[PDB]
């Protein structure tokens, strides 16, 4: 569908039925965008994981599959805790804790980029909530 800009706490609320897409307020969700600062960096075999916090009450593990994009993966571990990133990716529900498989990301170095991201997310959530209430 779209790029669904979401808060991390809401990402953790998406419902899955294991048996490609999840559902948020009844809406099918696959591709999502999140914005927050890097709380941690963990290195795994074949993947780098950035834990991101957007202050929504939950943090999100963002996975960079090295072989899928060596370039982006390199930029990912070049980051430092405290850096703010805008990540676009797909939700992964293999484990009990959902994670985001990154497709692309950009570091946000303009201090104003974050509140604009919060603004966009509150507006998006409000609109989807209204639609969901009118159709249900």
């Amino acid at each position: 569908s779209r790029w669904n800009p979401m808060f991390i706490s809401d990402v953790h609320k998406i419902s899955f039925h294991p048996h490609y897409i999840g559902f948020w307020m009844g809406f099918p969700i696959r591709w999502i965008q999140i914005v927050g600062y890097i709380a941690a960096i963990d290195i795994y075999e074949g993947k780098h994981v950035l834990t991101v916090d957007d202050c929504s009450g939950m943090v999100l593990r963002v996975v960079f599959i090295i072989q899928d994009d060596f370039s982006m993966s390199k930029r990912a571990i070049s980051m430092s805790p405290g850096n703010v990133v805008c990540v676009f990716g797909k939700i992964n529900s293999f484990r009990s804790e959902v994670e985001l498989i990154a497709q692309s990301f950009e570091e946000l170095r303009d201090p104003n980029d974050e509140w604009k991201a919060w603004q966009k997310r509150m507006r998006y959530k409000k609109n989807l909530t209204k639609i969901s209430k009118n159709h249900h």
Partner: protein
């Protein structure tokens, strides 16, 4: 070192409304920086920030704005974990969004 808990985005004037040990994120204006203690203010409110373990590698200018992520030690004192300059930030829009995030579910 930051912990896996999510920070509560608040105003400095709300720090004393939170529990000790809680991770907090807030913006503040530099009033003074001495003896490992950074004093930040926002309007009539203020907070003492311990930056002894996270000494910036660049000089801090009086009245500049900083984004802080840290843990509340006790009323009026925060142990800093992360510091970043908020230079050029649109304060009115920033406070508007902080308020909205606290009010919207």
């Amino acid at each position: 070192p930051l912990g896996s808990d999510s920070a509560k985005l608040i105003f400095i004037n709300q720090i004393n409304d939170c529990k000790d040990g809680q991770k907090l994120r807030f913006l503040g204006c530099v009033q003074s920086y001495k003896n490992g203690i950074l004093r930040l203010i926002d309007g009539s409110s203020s907070v003492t920030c311990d930056v002894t373990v996270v000494l910036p590698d660049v000089s801090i200018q009086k009245h500049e704005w900083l984004n802080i992520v840290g843990r509340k030690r006790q009323d009026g004192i925060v142990d800093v974990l992360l510091i970043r300059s908020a230079v050029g930030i649109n304060l009115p829009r920033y406070r508007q969004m902080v308020s909205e995030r606290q009010k919207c579910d």
